[PDB]
Amino acid sequence: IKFIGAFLLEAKILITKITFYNNSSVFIETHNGNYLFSGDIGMPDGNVDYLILESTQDELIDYIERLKYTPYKVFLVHGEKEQREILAKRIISKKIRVELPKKVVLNINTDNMCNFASYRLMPFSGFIVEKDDRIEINDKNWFDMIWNEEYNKMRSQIVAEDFSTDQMALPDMSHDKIIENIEYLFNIKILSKNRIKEFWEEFCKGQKAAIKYITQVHRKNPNTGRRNWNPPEGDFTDNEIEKLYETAYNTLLSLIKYDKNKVYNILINFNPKL
Amino acid sequence: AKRIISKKIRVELPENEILIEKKVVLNINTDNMCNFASYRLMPFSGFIVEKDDRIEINDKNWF
Amino acid sequence: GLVPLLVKKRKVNKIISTPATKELCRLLFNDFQRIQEENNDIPLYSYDDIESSFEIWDEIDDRNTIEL
Protein backbone atom coordinates (compact mmCIF):
# COMPACT_ATOMS: atom_id res chain seq x y z
CA ILE A 1 0.00 0.00 0.00
CA LYS A 2 1.01 3.63 -0.54
CA PHE A 3 0.52 5.77 2.59
CA ILE A 4 -0.06 9.08 0.81
CA GLY A 5 -2.32 10.55 3.49
CA ALA A 6 -5.69 8.79 2.07
CA PHE A 7 -4.02 5.49 1.14
CA LEU A 8 -3.43 3.71 -2.16
CA LEU A 9 -3.25 0.08 -3.35
CA GLU A 10 -2.57 -1.93 -6.49
CA ALA A 11 -6.64 -0.85 -9.94
CA LYS A 12 -5.50 2.09 -7.81
CA ILE A 13 -8.16 2.34 -5.06
CA LEU A 14 -7.58 5.61 -3.19
CA ILE A 15 -9.47 4.71 0.06
CA THR A 16 -11.00 -7.24 -6.23
CA LYS A 17 -13.92 -8.49 -4.09
CA ILE A 18 -14.47 -5.42 -1.89
CA THR A 19 -17.01 -5.48 0.95
CA PHE A 20 -17.88 -2.78 3.49
CA TYR A 21 -18.53 -3.44 7.21
CA ASN A 22 -19.55 -0.94 9.96
CA ASN A 23 -16.60 0.65 11.77
CA SER A 24 -18.87 1.65 14.77
CA SER A 25 -14.13 -0.45 7.37
CA VAL A 26 -13.33 -1.60 3.87
CA PHE A 27 -12.37 -5.22 3.22
CA ILE A 28 -10.42 -5.20 -0.03
CA GLU A 29 -9.68 -8.78 -0.96
CA THR A 30 -7.02 -9.18 -3.61
CA HIS A 31 -5.27 -12.29 -4.88
CA ASN A 32 -2.15 -10.79 -3.25
CA GLY A 33 -3.65 -10.89 0.21
CA ASN A 34 -6.93 -9.71 1.70
CA TYR A 35 -6.33 -6.16 2.91
CA LEU A 36 -8.48 -4.53 5.58
CA PHE A 37 -8.33 -0.72 5.73
CA SER A 38 -10.01 -0.55 9.16
CA GLY A 39 -10.51 3.20 8.99
CA ASP A 40 -11.40 4.92 12.25
CA ILE A 41 -13.16 3.04 15.04
CA GLY A 42 -13.21 5.13 18.20
CA MET A 43 -15.29 -7.29 11.49
CA PRO A 44 -14.92 -9.73 8.53
CA ASP A 45 -15.39 -13.36 9.65
CA GLY A 46 -12.76 -14.61 7.21
CA ASN A 47 -9.12 -14.39 6.16
CA VAL A 48 -7.40 -11.11 6.91
CA ASP A 49 -3.78 -10.61 5.94
CA TYR A 50 -2.98 -6.90 6.29
CA LEU A 51 -4.82 -4.69 8.80
CA ILE A 52 -4.31 -0.99 8.04
CA LEU A 53 -5.39 0.20 11.48
CA GLU A 54 -5.76 3.87 12.42
CA SER A 55 -4.32 4.52 15.89
CA THR A 56 -5.62 7.59 17.70
CA GLN A 57 -5.86 1.98 23.15
CA ASP A 58 -7.09 -1.26 24.75
CA GLU A 59 -9.99 -0.92 22.30
CA LEU A 60 -7.63 -1.38 19.35
CA ILE A 61 -6.20 -4.56 20.90
CA ASP A 62 -9.77 -5.77 21.50
CA TYR A 63 -10.55 -5.09 17.84
CA ILE A 64 -7.45 -7.03 16.76
CA GLU A 65 -8.24 -9.95 19.09
CA ARG A 66 -11.55 -10.79 17.45
CA LEU A 67 -10.35 -11.31 13.83
CA LYS A 68 -10.05 -14.98 12.94
CA TYR A 69 -6.55 -15.77 11.58
CA THR A 70 -4.55 -12.95 13.26
CA PRO A 71 -3.01 -10.59 10.67
CA TYR A 72 0.47 -10.90 9.25
CA LYS A 73 1.24 -7.17 9.46
CA VAL A 74 -0.68 -4.21 11.00
CA PHE A 75 0.12 -0.85 9.35
CA LEU A 76 -0.51 1.81 11.98
CA VAL A 77 -1.64 5.22 10.74
CA HIS A 78 -3.38 8.51 11.74
CA GLY A 79 -1.38 8.97 14.93
CA GLU A 80 1.45 11.01 16.35
CA LYS A 81 5.06 9.91 16.81
CA GLU A 82 4.40 8.55 20.28
CA GLN A 83 0.86 7.12 19.77
CA ARG A 84 1.70 4.82 16.82
CA GLU A 85 4.88 3.80 18.73
CA ILE A 86 3.14 2.81 21.99
CA LEU A 87 0.40 0.90 20.15
CA ALA A 88 3.17 -0.74 18.14
CA LYS A 89 4.97 -1.91 21.35
CA ARG A 90 1.72 -3.39 22.66
CA ILE A 91 1.02 -5.20 19.36
CA ILE A 92 4.62 -6.61 19.24
CA SER A 93 3.87 -8.01 22.69
CA LYS A 94 0.89 -9.87 21.14
CA LYS A 95 3.23 -11.50 18.53
CA ILE A 96 1.94 -9.53 15.53
CA ARG A 97 4.22 -7.63 13.14
CA VAL A 98 3.74 -3.86 12.89
CA GLU A 99 4.77 -1.42 10.16
CA LEU A 100 4.81 2.35 11.03
CA PRO A 101 4.57 4.26 7.66
CA LYS A 102 11.32 2.16 -8.45
CA LYS A 103 14.95 1.20 -8.94
CA VAL A 104 15.97 -1.93 -7.00
CA VAL A 105 18.86 -1.41 -4.52
CA LEU A 106 21.28 -4.38 -4.85
CA ASN A 107 23.84 -4.38 -1.99
CA ILE A 108 27.11 -6.09 -3.12
CA ASN A 109 29.07 -5.99 0.19
CA THR A 110 29.96 -8.24 3.24
CA ASP A 111 27.71 -9.67 6.02
CA ASN A 112 29.66 -9.15 9.28
CA MET A 113 27.30 -7.87 12.02
CA CYS A 114 26.67 -6.63 15.61
CA ASN A 115 23.75 -6.60 18.06
CA PHE A 116 23.88 -2.90 18.81
CA ALA A 117 21.08 -1.43 21.00
CA SER A 118 18.49 -4.01 19.76
CA TYR A 119 19.21 -2.81 16.18
CA ARG A 120 21.34 -5.45 14.37
CA LEU A 121 23.78 -3.19 12.47
CA MET A 122 27.13 -3.10 10.62
CA PRO A 123 29.43 -0.16 9.80
CA PHE A 124 29.99 0.34 6.08
CA SER A 125 31.75 3.10 4.20
CA GLY A 126 31.26 2.50 0.48
CA PHE A 127 29.89 3.50 -2.88
CA ILE A 128 26.40 3.58 -4.42
CA VAL A 129 26.37 3.10 -8.21
CA GLU A 130 23.17 3.80 -10.20
CA LYS A 131 22.70 1.56 -13.22
CA ASP A 132 19.52 2.25 -15.22
CA ASP A 133 17.47 -0.40 -13.42
CA ARG A 134 19.31 -0.59 -10.10
CA ILE A 135 21.43 1.25 -7.48
CA GLU A 136 24.21 -1.17 -6.39
CA ILE A 137 25.90 -0.69 -3.02
CA ASN A 138 29.48 -1.87 -3.43
CA ASP A 139 32.70 -1.71 -1.45
CA LYS A 140 35.99 0.12 -2.02
CA ASN A 141 37.68 -2.83 -3.79
CA TRP A 142 35.28 -2.07 -6.66
CA PHE A 143 36.60 1.51 -6.64
CA ASP A 144 40.17 0.24 -6.71
CA MET A 145 39.16 -1.97 -9.67
CA ILE A 146 37.74 0.93 -11.69
CA TRP A 147 40.75 3.04 -10.68
CA ASN A 148 43.15 0.44 -12.07
CA GLU A 149 40.97 0.38 -15.20
CA GLU A 150 41.12 4.15 -15.69
CA TYR A 151 44.85 4.30 -14.88
CA ASN A 152 45.65 1.41 -17.26
CA LYS A 153 43.65 3.17 -19.97
CA MET A 154 44.80 6.75 -19.28
CA ARG A 155 48.48 5.82 -19.41
CA SER A 156 47.84 4.23 -22.84
CA GLN A 157 46.74 7.41 -24.53
CA ILE A 158 49.81 9.64 -24.61
CA VAL A 159 52.76 7.50 -25.71
CA ALA A 160 55.10 10.59 -25.39
CA GLU A 161 57.23 12.32 -28.05
CA ASP A 162 54.12 12.16 -30.25
CA PHE A 163 52.86 14.67 -32.85
CA SER A 164 56.00 16.64 -32.02
CA THR A 165 58.95 18.05 -33.94
CA ASP A 166 62.29 16.66 -32.73
CA GLN A 167 65.42 14.75 -33.87
CA MET A 168 67.67 9.36 -35.94
CA ALA A 169 70.37 7.79 -38.16
CA LEU A 170 67.81 5.90 -40.22
CA PRO A 171 69.06 3.82 -43.23
CA ASP A 172 68.92 4.93 -46.92
CA MET A 173 67.70 3.28 -50.17
CA SER A 174 66.22 5.17 -53.21
CA HIS A 175 62.54 5.91 -53.86
CA ASP A 176 62.61 3.21 -56.58
CA LYS A 177 64.03 0.65 -54.12
CA ILE A 178 61.38 1.53 -51.52
CA ILE A 179 58.68 1.17 -54.23
CA GLU A 180 60.07 -2.18 -55.44
CA ASN A 181 60.42 -3.57 -51.91
CA ILE A 182 56.93 -2.46 -50.83
CA GLU A 183 55.54 -3.99 -54.04
CA TYR A 184 57.26 -7.34 -53.37
CA LEU A 185 56.27 -7.30 -49.69
CA PHE A 186 52.67 -6.52 -50.61
CA ASN A 187 52.47 -9.35 -53.17
CA ILE A 188 53.80 -11.78 -50.60
CA LYS A 189 51.58 -11.08 -47.63
CA ILE A 190 54.08 -9.46 -45.24
CA LEU A 191 53.22 -5.79 -45.69
CA SER A 192 49.43 -5.65 -45.70
CA LYS A 193 46.82 -2.91 -45.87
CA ASN A 194 46.40 -3.07 -42.09
CA ARG A 195 50.18 -2.98 -41.59
CA ILE A 196 50.65 -0.03 -43.97
CA LYS A 197 47.67 1.76 -42.40
CA GLU A 198 48.95 1.29 -38.84
CA PHE A 199 52.45 2.34 -39.94
CA TRP A 200 50.99 5.56 -41.37
CA GLU A 201 48.95 6.07 -38.19
CA GLU A 202 52.07 5.70 -36.01
CA PHE A 203 54.06 7.78 -38.52
CA CYS A 204 51.73 10.77 -38.18
CA LYS A 205 52.46 10.67 -34.42
CA GLY A 206 56.13 11.38 -35.10
CA GLN A 207 59.05 9.50 -36.57
CA LYS A 208 59.83 8.03 -33.12
CA ALA A 209 56.43 6.35 -32.78
CA ALA A 210 56.87 4.80 -36.22
CA ILE A 211 60.31 3.50 -35.19
CA LYS A 212 58.75 2.04 -32.02
CA TYR A 213 55.99 0.41 -34.09
CA ILE A 214 58.47 -1.08 -36.54
CA THR A 215 60.82 -2.35 -33.85
CA GLN A 216 57.73 -3.82 -32.15
CA VAL A 217 56.77 -5.76 -35.31
CA HIS A 218 60.37 -6.84 -35.97
CA ARG A 219 61.23 -7.92 -32.40
CA LYS A 220 61.96 -11.62 -32.48
CA ASN A 221 60.73 -12.68 -29.05
CA PRO A 222 63.58 -14.50 -27.24
CA ASN A 223 61.19 -17.15 -25.88
CA THR A 224 58.97 -18.06 -28.83
CA GLY A 225 61.08 -16.86 -31.76
CA ARG A 226 58.24 -15.20 -33.67
CA ARG A 227 58.37 -11.74 -35.18
CA ASN A 228 54.98 -10.01 -35.39
CA TRP A 229 55.05 -9.68 -39.18
CA ASN A 230 52.39 -11.43 -41.18
CA PRO A 231 54.07 -14.61 -42.51
CA PRO A 232 54.89 -14.69 -46.23
CA GLU A 233 52.66 -16.40 -48.79
CA GLY A 234 54.71 -18.86 -50.81
CA ASP A 235 57.30 -21.60 -50.36
CA PHE A 236 60.24 -19.65 -48.97
CA THR A 237 62.89 -21.24 -46.78
CA ASP A 238 63.60 -20.13 -43.20
CA ASN A 239 66.68 -18.06 -44.08
CA GLU A 240 64.74 -16.48 -46.96
CA ILE A 241 61.83 -15.64 -44.62
CA GLU A 242 64.34 -14.03 -42.24
CA LYS A 243 65.79 -11.99 -45.12
CA LEU A 244 62.30 -10.93 -46.26
CA TYR A 245 61.45 -9.76 -42.73
CA GLU A 246 64.75 -7.85 -42.57
CA THR A 247 63.96 -6.22 -45.94
CA ALA A 248 60.54 -5.21 -44.57
CA TYR A 249 62.20 -3.63 -41.51
CA ASN A 250 64.80 -1.74 -43.56
CA THR A 251 62.27 -0.56 -46.17
CA LEU A 252 59.81 0.82 -43.62
CA LEU A 253 62.60 2.39 -41.51
CA SER A 254 63.99 4.03 -44.65
CA LEU A 255 60.52 5.30 -45.57
CA ILE A 256 60.34 7.01 -42.15
CA LYS A 257 63.19 9.32 -43.28
CA TYR A 258 61.23 10.63 -46.29
CA ASP A 259 58.80 13.49 -45.78
CA LYS A 260 55.11 12.92 -45.11
CA ASN A 261 53.93 13.75 -48.63
CA LYS A 262 56.32 11.21 -50.14
CA VAL A 263 55.31 8.56 -47.58
CA TYR A 264 51.64 9.20 -48.39
CA ASN A 265 52.23 9.13 -52.16
CA ILE A 266 54.17 5.88 -51.82
CA LEU A 267 51.60 4.27 -49.51
CA ILE A 268 48.33 5.15 -51.27
CA ASN A 269 49.35 3.07 -54.27
CA PHE A 270 49.11 0.01 -51.99
CA ASN A 271 46.40 1.03 -49.47
CA PRO A 272 44.13 3.88 -50.68
CA LYS A 273 42.81 4.76 -47.20
CA LEU A 274 45.99 6.16 -45.59
CA ALA B 1 -4.97 -28.21 12.97
CA LYS B 2 -8.24 -27.34 14.74
CA ARG B 3 -6.40 -26.37 17.91
CA ILE B 4 -3.87 -24.26 15.94
CA ILE B 5 -6.85 -22.52 14.27
CA SER B 6 -8.22 -21.92 17.79
CA LYS B 7 -4.92 -20.15 18.63
CA LYS B 8 -5.58 -17.89 15.54
CA ILE B 9 -2.94 -19.32 13.15
CA ARG B 10 -3.48 -20.36 9.53
CA VAL B 11 -3.12 -24.08 8.77
CA GLU B 12 -2.48 -25.63 5.37
CA LEU B 13 -2.85 -29.38 5.92
CA PRO B 14 -1.13 -31.33 3.09
CA GLU B 15 -4.24 -31.67 0.90
CA ASN B 16 -4.61 -28.06 -0.30
CA GLU B 17 -0.82 -16.05 -0.60
CA ILE B 18 0.84 -12.84 0.61
CA LEU B 19 3.90 -11.78 -1.40
CA ILE B 20 6.50 -11.33 1.32
CA GLU B 21 9.41 -9.43 -0.16
CA LYS B 22 12.35 -8.32 1.96
CA LYS B 23 13.25 -4.95 0.50
CA VAL B 24 16.40 -2.88 0.72
CA VAL B 25 15.60 0.78 1.33
CA LEU B 26 18.33 3.28 0.51
CA ASN B 27 17.45 6.12 2.98
CA ILE B 28 20.53 8.22 2.08
CA ASN B 29 20.77 11.30 -0.19
CA THR B 30 21.27 10.42 -3.85
CA ASP B 31 21.14 13.93 -5.40
CA ASN B 32 24.91 14.61 -5.38
CA MET B 33 26.37 11.83 -7.51
CA CYS B 34 29.34 11.88 -9.87
CA ASN B 35 30.61 10.02 -12.92
CA PHE B 36 34.20 8.77 -13.13
CA ALA B 37 34.53 5.60 -15.24
CA SER B 38 31.06 5.59 -16.87
CA TYR B 39 29.49 4.80 -13.49
CA ARG B 40 27.10 7.11 -11.65
CA LEU B 41 28.89 6.72 -8.31
CA MET B 42 28.76 8.36 -4.88
CA PRO B 43 30.95 7.81 -1.77
CA PHE B 44 29.05 7.38 1.48
CA SER B 45 29.96 6.55 5.08
CA GLY B 46 27.01 4.91 6.79
CA PHE B 47 25.50 1.91 8.58
CA ILE B 48 23.79 -1.21 7.23
CA VAL B 49 21.02 -2.23 9.63
CA GLU B 50 19.24 -5.58 9.37
CA LYS B 51 15.58 -5.21 10.30
CA ASP B 52 12.88 -7.87 9.77
CA ASP B 53 11.36 -7.72 6.23
CA ARG B 54 13.68 -4.77 5.57
CA ILE B 55 17.44 -4.27 5.34
CA GLU B 56 18.02 -0.56 5.68
CA ILE B 57 21.11 1.32 4.71
CA ASN B 58 20.99 4.32 7.02
CA ASP B 59 23.25 7.34 7.25
CA LYS B 60 25.35 8.40 10.25
CA ASN B 61 22.50 10.66 11.43
CA TRP B 62 20.41 7.55 12.17
CA PHE B 63 23.21 6.20 14.33
CA GLY C 1 17.16 -42.28 3.93
CA LEU C 2 17.09 -41.06 0.35
CA VAL C 3 20.26 -38.97 0.11
CA PRO C 4 22.44 -41.63 -1.64
CA LEU C 5 19.69 -42.10 -4.24
CA LEU C 6 19.81 -38.38 -5.04
CA VAL C 7 23.59 -38.73 -5.26
CA LYS C 8 23.02 -41.63 -7.70
CA LYS C 9 20.74 -39.57 -9.95
CA ARG C 10 23.13 -36.59 -9.52
CA LYS C 11 20.34 -34.24 -8.48
CA VAL C 12 22.07 -33.01 -5.29
CA ASN C 13 25.18 -30.85 -5.08
CA LYS C 14 25.64 -30.26 -1.33
CA ILE C 15 24.37 -32.22 1.63
CA ILE C 16 24.36 -30.05 4.74
CA SER C 17 23.62 -31.58 8.12
CA THR C 18 24.97 -31.48 11.63
CA PRO C 19 28.24 -33.38 12.33
CA ALA C 20 26.37 -35.90 14.49
CA THR C 21 23.89 -36.40 11.63
CA LYS C 22 26.82 -37.11 9.28
CA GLU C 23 28.40 -39.62 11.66
CA LEU C 24 25.05 -41.30 12.42
CA CYS C 25 24.09 -41.46 8.72
CA ARG C 26 27.44 -43.23 8.14
CA LEU C 27 25.86 -45.98 10.25
CA LEU C 28 22.24 -45.81 9.02
CA PHE C 29 23.07 -45.88 5.31
CA ASN C 30 25.41 -48.88 5.59
CA ASP C 31 22.85 -50.64 7.77
CA PHE C 32 20.06 -49.89 5.23
CA GLN C 33 22.12 -51.32 2.37
CA ARG C 34 23.02 -54.35 4.51
CA ILE C 35 19.32 -54.90 5.21
CA GLN C 36 18.34 -54.37 1.56
CA GLU C 37 20.84 -56.97 0.39
CA GLU C 38 20.06 -59.37 3.25
CA ASN C 39 16.29 -59.12 2.65
CA ASN C 40 16.93 -59.79 -1.10
CA ASP C 41 15.09 -56.69 -2.30
CA ILE C 42 16.79 -54.86 -5.24
CA PRO C 43 19.11 -52.39 -3.42
CA LEU C 44 17.79 -48.82 -3.44
CA TYR C 45 21.36 -47.57 -3.85
CA SER C 46 24.88 -48.93 -3.30
CA TYR C 47 27.79 -48.49 -0.88
CA ASP C 48 29.49 -46.39 -3.57
CA ASP C 49 26.46 -44.09 -3.49
CA ILE C 50 26.86 -43.72 0.29
CA GLU C 51 30.57 -42.92 -0.09
CA SER C 52 29.88 -40.32 -2.80
CA SER C 53 27.14 -38.86 -0.58
CA PHE C 54 29.74 -38.33 2.12
CA GLU C 55 32.06 -36.91 -0.54
CA ILE C 56 29.54 -34.11 -1.18
CA TRP C 57 28.55 -33.83 2.51
CA ASP C 58 29.33 -30.54 4.25
CA GLU C 59 28.58 -30.22 7.96
CA ILE C 60 27.51 -27.17 9.97
CA ASP C 61 26.31 -27.04 13.55
CA ASP C 62 23.57 -25.15 15.37
CA ARG C 63 23.34 -21.34 15.23
CA ASN C 64 25.79 -20.86 12.37
CA THR C 65 24.35 -19.05 9.38
CA ILE C 66 25.59 -20.20 6.02
CA GLU C 67 25.05 -17.87 3.06
CA LEU C 68 24.35 -20.01 0.00
Binding site: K131, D132, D133, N152, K153, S156 | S38, Y39 | -
Partner: protein
Amino acid sequence: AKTMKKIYVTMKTLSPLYTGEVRREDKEAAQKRVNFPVRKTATNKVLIPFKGALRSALEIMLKAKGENVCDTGESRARPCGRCVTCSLFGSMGRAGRASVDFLISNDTKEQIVRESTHLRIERQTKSASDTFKGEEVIEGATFTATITISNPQEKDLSLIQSALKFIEENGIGGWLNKGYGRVSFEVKSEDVATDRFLK
Protein backbone atom coordinates in the same frame (compact mmCIF):
# COMPACT_ATOMS: atom_id res chain seq x y z
CA ALA D 1 -3.86 -0.05 -38.80
CA LYS D 2 -5.70 -0.03 -35.47
CA THR D 3 -3.46 -2.74 -33.97
CA MET D 4 0.30 -3.26 -33.56
CA LYS D 5 1.91 -6.59 -32.58
CA LYS D 6 4.53 -6.20 -29.87
CA ILE D 7 6.75 -9.23 -29.33
CA TYR D 8 8.87 -8.92 -26.17
CA VAL D 9 11.87 -11.20 -26.59
CA THR D 10 14.02 -12.43 -23.70
CA MET D 11 17.22 -14.24 -24.65
CA LYS D 12 19.49 -16.25 -22.35
CA THR D 13 22.97 -17.31 -23.42
CA LEU D 14 23.66 -21.04 -23.12
CA SER D 15 27.23 -20.71 -24.48
CA PRO D 16 29.79 -17.89 -24.41
CA LEU D 17 28.61 -15.11 -26.70
CA TYR D 18 30.81 -12.86 -28.80
CA THR D 19 29.55 -10.10 -31.06
CA GLY D 20 32.46 -7.95 -32.09
CA GLU D 21 32.92 -4.22 -31.79
CA VAL D 22 31.85 -2.07 -34.71
CA ARG D 23 32.69 1.39 -33.35
CA ARG D 24 36.16 2.08 -34.72
CA GLU D 25 37.17 4.44 -31.91
CA ASP D 26 36.03 1.92 -29.30
CA LYS D 27 37.67 -0.98 -31.16
CA GLU D 28 40.93 0.95 -31.54
CA ALA D 29 40.79 1.96 -27.85
CA ALA D 30 40.19 -1.64 -26.76
CA GLN D 31 42.58 -3.52 -29.09
CA LYS D 32 45.32 -2.25 -26.79
CA ARG D 33 44.27 -4.93 -24.27
CA VAL D 34 41.90 -7.40 -25.93
CA ASN D 35 42.32 -8.44 -29.57
CA PHE D 36 38.59 -9.16 -30.02
CA PRO D 37 36.42 -6.62 -28.20
CA VAL D 38 32.68 -7.16 -27.94
CA ARG D 39 30.32 -4.50 -29.20
CA LYS D 40 29.11 -2.52 -26.23
CA THR D 41 26.87 0.44 -25.59
CA ALA D 42 28.16 3.68 -24.13
CA THR D 43 25.93 2.86 -21.14
CA ASN D 44 28.22 -0.20 -20.74
CA LYS D 45 25.66 -2.81 -21.83
CA VAL D 46 26.07 -5.22 -24.76
CA LEU D 47 24.36 -4.70 -28.13
CA ILE D 48 23.63 -7.59 -30.47
CA PRO D 49 22.34 -6.89 -34.02
CA PHE D 50 19.00 -8.82 -34.16
CA LYS D 51 17.12 -7.89 -37.40
CA GLY D 52 19.62 -9.33 -39.86
CA ALA D 53 19.73 -12.61 -37.95
CA LEU D 54 15.93 -12.85 -38.17
CA ARG D 55 15.95 -11.94 -41.87
CA SER D 56 18.74 -14.45 -42.58
CA ALA D 57 16.91 -17.16 -40.61
CA LEU D 58 13.61 -16.68 -42.44
CA GLU D 59 15.41 -16.31 -45.79
CA ILE D 60 17.33 -19.59 -45.41
CA MET D 61 14.23 -21.35 -44.05
CA LEU D 62 11.72 -20.06 -46.61
CA LYS D 63 14.02 -20.60 -49.58
CA ALA D 64 14.18 -24.25 -48.42
CA LYS D 65 10.41 -24.57 -47.90
CA GLY D 66 9.94 -23.53 -51.53
CA GLU D 67 8.46 -20.05 -51.12
CA ASN D 68 9.38 -17.05 -53.29
CA VAL D 69 11.65 -15.34 -50.76
CA CYS D 70 14.53 -13.29 -52.21
CA ASP D 71 18.14 -13.24 -51.05
CA THR D 72 19.34 -9.97 -49.51
CA GLY D 73 22.63 -11.52 -48.39
CA GLU D 74 24.46 -11.55 -51.72
CA SER D 75 26.45 -8.40 -52.45
CA ARG D 76 24.34 -5.27 -53.16
CA ALA D 77 21.15 -7.26 -53.66
CA ARG D 78 17.90 -5.46 -54.34
CA PRO D 79 15.05 -6.64 -52.09
CA CYS D 80 12.19 -7.40 -54.48
CA GLY D 81 9.13 -6.38 -52.49
CA ARG D 82 6.80 -9.29 -53.16
CA CYS D 83 7.82 -11.87 -50.54
CA VAL D 84 7.15 -12.27 -46.86
CA THR D 85 10.66 -11.30 -45.79
CA CYS D 86 10.29 -8.12 -47.85
CA SER D 87 6.90 -7.51 -46.24
CA LEU D 88 8.22 -8.09 -42.71
CA PHE D 89 11.80 -6.79 -42.89
CA GLY D 90 11.75 -4.42 -45.84
CA SER D 91 12.06 -3.76 -49.57
CA MET D 92 13.67 -0.82 -51.35
CA GLY D 93 10.33 0.95 -51.76
CA ARG D 94 8.47 -0.14 -48.64
CA ALA D 95 9.92 -0.40 -45.16
CA GLY D 96 9.55 -3.52 -43.07
CA ARG D 97 6.60 -3.78 -40.72
CA ALA D 98 8.64 -5.58 -38.05
CA SER D 99 10.73 -2.98 -36.20
CA VAL D 100 13.34 -5.18 -34.53
CA ASP D 101 15.23 -3.69 -31.60
CA PHE D 102 18.77 -4.58 -30.71
CA LEU D 103 19.41 -7.25 -28.11
CA ILE D 104 20.62 -4.91 -25.38
CA SER D 105 21.65 -6.79 -22.23
CA ASN D 106 20.02 -6.30 -18.86
CA ASP D 107 23.36 -6.34 -17.02
CA THR D 108 26.50 -4.24 -17.53
CA LYS D 109 29.93 -5.36 -18.89
CA GLU D 110 31.50 -6.23 -15.51
CA GLN D 111 28.93 -8.88 -14.61
CA ILE D 112 28.58 -10.40 -18.10
CA VAL D 113 31.73 -9.65 -20.11
CA ARG D 114 34.92 -11.62 -19.48
CA GLU D 115 38.27 -11.64 -21.27
CA SER D 116 39.31 -15.07 -22.54
CA THR D 117 42.51 -16.44 -24.05
CA HIS D 118 42.17 -18.42 -27.26
CA LEU D 119 44.96 -20.32 -28.97
CA ARG D 120 46.20 -21.73 -32.22
CA ILE D 121 48.01 -25.03 -31.61
CA GLU D 122 50.61 -26.50 -33.98
CA ARG D 123 49.64 -29.98 -35.14
CA GLN D 124 53.15 -31.54 -35.04
CA THR D 125 54.42 -29.80 -31.91
CA LYS D 126 51.09 -29.93 -30.01
CA SER D 127 51.86 -26.48 -28.62
CA ALA D 128 50.68 -22.90 -29.04
CA SER D 129 51.73 -21.14 -32.21
CA ASP D 130 49.40 -18.21 -31.70
CA THR D 131 47.66 -16.65 -28.74
CA PHE D 132 44.94 -14.04 -28.83
CA LYS D 133 42.53 -12.58 -26.35
CA GLY D 134 38.84 -12.09 -26.83
CA GLU D 135 35.93 -10.57 -25.02
CA GLU D 136 32.83 -12.64 -24.49
CA VAL D 137 29.48 -12.64 -22.75
CA ILE D 138 28.95 -15.29 -20.04
CA GLU D 139 26.44 -18.13 -20.07
CA GLY D 140 23.10 -17.37 -18.49
CA ALA D 141 23.25 -13.69 -19.41
CA THR D 142 19.95 -12.06 -20.29
CA PHE D 143 19.30 -9.81 -23.28
CA THR D 144 15.99 -8.18 -24.23
CA ALA D 145 14.41 -6.95 -27.46
CA THR D 146 10.98 -5.97 -28.81
CA ILE D 147 9.88 -6.68 -32.37
CA THR D 148 7.04 -4.31 -33.28
CA ILE D 149 4.96 -5.19 -36.34
CA SER D 150 3.00 -2.11 -37.43
CA ASN D 151 0.48 -3.61 -39.87
CA PRO D 152 0.00 -6.99 -38.17
CA GLN D 153 -0.75 -9.91 -40.46
CA GLU D 154 -1.58 -13.35 -39.08
CA LYS D 155 1.56 -15.31 -40.03
CA ASP D 156 3.82 -12.71 -38.46
CA LEU D 157 4.35 -14.23 -35.02
CA SER D 158 4.66 -17.78 -36.39
CA LEU D 159 7.42 -16.52 -38.73
CA ILE D 160 9.32 -14.48 -36.12
CA GLN D 161 9.05 -17.43 -33.71
CA SER D 162 10.16 -19.88 -36.40
CA ALA D 163 13.22 -17.71 -37.00
CA LEU D 164 13.87 -17.61 -33.29
CA LYS D 165 14.30 -21.40 -33.27
CA PHE D 166 16.75 -21.09 -36.17
CA ILE D 167 18.74 -18.57 -34.09
CA GLU D 168 18.63 -21.16 -31.27
CA GLU D 169 20.07 -24.03 -33.30
CA ASN D 170 22.61 -21.94 -35.28
CA GLY D 171 23.63 -18.92 -33.26
CA ILE D 172 23.04 -15.21 -33.00
CA GLY D 173 26.37 -13.49 -33.63
CA GLY D 174 30.09 -14.06 -33.89
CA TRP D 175 32.15 -17.25 -33.82
CA LEU D 176 29.22 -19.63 -34.30
CA ASN D 177 31.29 -22.52 -35.65
CA LYS D 178 33.54 -22.75 -32.60
CA GLY D 179 30.48 -23.08 -30.37
CA TYR D 180 29.65 -19.50 -29.47
CA GLY D 181 26.30 -17.76 -29.51
CA ARG D 182 24.08 -20.68 -28.49
CA VAL D 183 21.08 -19.07 -26.85
CA SER D 184 17.45 -19.58 -25.85
CA PHE D 185 14.53 -17.29 -26.67
CA GLU D 186 11.34 -16.61 -24.72
CA VAL D 187 8.48 -14.73 -26.36
CA LYS D 188 5.58 -12.97 -24.64
CA SER D 189 3.60 -11.52 -27.54
CA GLU D 190 0.88 -8.83 -27.37
CA ASP D 191 -1.26 -6.95 -29.93
CA VAL D 192 -1.70 -3.42 -28.56
CA ALA D 193 -3.75 -0.70 -30.23
CA THR D 194 -1.92 1.97 -32.21
CA ASP D 195 -3.75 4.76 -30.32
CA ARG D 196 -2.77 3.36 -26.89
CA PHE D 197 -0.86 6.56 -26.02
CA LEU D 198 -3.57 8.97 -27.22
CA LYS D 199 -6.25 7.88 -24.73
